[PDB]
Design a protein around this ligand. Structure first.
Ligand SMILES: [Co+2]
Length: 165
């Protein structure tokens, strides 16, 4: 099922997700509905906070063929290095993009859809996406790295887009 994605300035986007206690059938259904939502909204990542599920669950697919499902449940950053940035967008900040500073490379550990622990070293786009999604789980949005003026402008633009419906 396609779930509703929250848009700024919704305060639910600022909530800190709790760790998933056990990866059971219910959590698998949430992961599957998150992928269906992410692909329906044409995105490359989605954090459960964005669909009002306040648990540490992230789905990502940065592949060209849209057939490489990455699940991060209870992710933890182990190492990072370098700096980079691209003009990021966000399904919760429709049609707005901005360059934000990110680590170039990261190493994380997390649980997959079967509840199995794994480690992943990422660079390039994947590293940026993992950082963006992990920020959503602690109530942080990419606009938070921008100047207060730019945050104001981005919020005003999104409210206008939504008003027009
Ligand atoms: Co986002």
């Amino acid at each position: 099922s396609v779930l509703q994605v929250l848009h700024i300035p919704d305060e639910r986007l600022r909530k800190v997700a709790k760790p998933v206690e056990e990866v059971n059938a219910e959590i698998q259904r949430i992961v599957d509905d998150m992928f269906e939502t992410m692909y329906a909204e044409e995105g490359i990542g989605l954090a459960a906070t964005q669909v009002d599920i306040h648990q540490r669950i992230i789905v990502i697919d940065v592949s060209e063929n849209r057939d490489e499902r990455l699940v991060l449940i209870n992710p933890e950053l182990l190492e990072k290095s370098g700096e980079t940035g691209i003009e990021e967008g966000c399904l919760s900040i429709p049609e707005q993009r901005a360059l934000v500073p990110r680590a170039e490379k990261v190493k994380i550990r997390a649980l997959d859809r079967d509840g199995k622990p794994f480690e992943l070293e990422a660079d390039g786009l994947l590293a940026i996406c993992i950082q963006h999604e992990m920020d959503h789980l602690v109530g942080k949005l990419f606009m938070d790295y921008l100047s207060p003026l730019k945050q104001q402008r981005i919020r005003q633009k999104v409210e206008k887009l939504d008003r027009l419906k």
